[PDB]
């Protein structure tokens, strides 16, 4: 399913069809993207369960070599990093950075804290490690100077913001899908009816609430105007 189908299901359940409606489809996109992460955490955080393939998305990143701090000699070895800021993954799925082929290569996505201290094991000196720095970029680290030649990776994970990771979606065979509404929403069908129910409950009450409608330099909500 696509963003369009979910959005218009929510709108039609709410009957927000007129262009002169207070709650636009943008409210629907916001609520859908947040309630998706809410439901996924509620279902896949208590105890470890199988996560379907629908909850995931693949972003494609372009890597650039950057200094550790600045251009000094003693400031440590350089890191690669994605050109643009990367979405934050949830901790419920199977995050994986792969070199444009999911079935090959070993690039390990680890925590920020762990990546401070990796590769000291002599047999793990050739493994590329990944983490999202507080800067918001995906930083790469390894002890094997060959890693700095890496130019492109794809990252598959259950990203915490469907909109961000869908905007960073990888080019399809036909070409890029410009409109977000024509892209595919990241959620299993078994979680779609609950998601629609939660969003529709969220906006049902506000839909029929009064407005401060008189232009009279006055607050008109206490009078239910």
């Amino acid at each position: 399913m696509t963003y369009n189908e979910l959005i218009y299901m929510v709108l039609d359940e709410l009957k927000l069809s007129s262009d002169d409606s207070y709650y636009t489809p943008d409210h629907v996109i916001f609520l859908l993207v947040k309630y998706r992460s809410f439901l996924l955490k509620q279902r896949y955080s208590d105890i470890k369960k199988q996560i379907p393939d629908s909850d995931y998305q693949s972003i494609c990143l372009d890597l650039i070599e950057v200094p550790a701090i600045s251009g000094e000699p003693c400031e440590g070895s350089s890191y690669l990093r994605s050109k643009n800021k990367v979405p934050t993954t949830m901790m419920i799925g199977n995050p994986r950075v792969y070199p444009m082929d999911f079935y090959q290569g070993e690039i390990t996505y680890i925590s920020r804290d762990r990546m401070r201290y990796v590769g000291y094991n002599k047999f793990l000196r050739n493994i590329i490690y990944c983490s999202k720095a507080p800067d918001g970029y995906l930083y790469f680290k390894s002890w094997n100077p060959q890693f700095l030649h890496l130019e492109k990776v794809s990252f598959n994970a259950i990203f915490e913001d469907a909109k961000e990771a869908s905007e960073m979606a990888c080019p399809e065979e036909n070409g890029t899908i410009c409109k977000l509404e024509d892209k595919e929403f990241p959620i299993e069908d078994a979680l779609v009816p609950p998601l629609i129910e939660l969003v529709v409950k969220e906006l049902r009450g506000p839909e029929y609430s009064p407005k401060d409608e008189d232009n009279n330099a006055k607050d008109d909500l206490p009078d239910a105007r």
Binding site: F38, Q42, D46, I47, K201, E202
Partner: protein
């Protein structure tokens, strides 16, 4: 009005506690 962003999680937590109570009584016995 209507909103279930706080009741849903409390119900889920209640059922999670029931889950843990149910699975905490599971024993693989001995002495056959």
């Amino acid at each position: 009005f209507g909103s279930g962003a706080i009741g849903y999680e409390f119900d889920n937590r209640y059922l999670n506690n029931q889950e843990m109570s149910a699975v905490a009584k599971q024993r693989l016995t001995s002495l056959p």
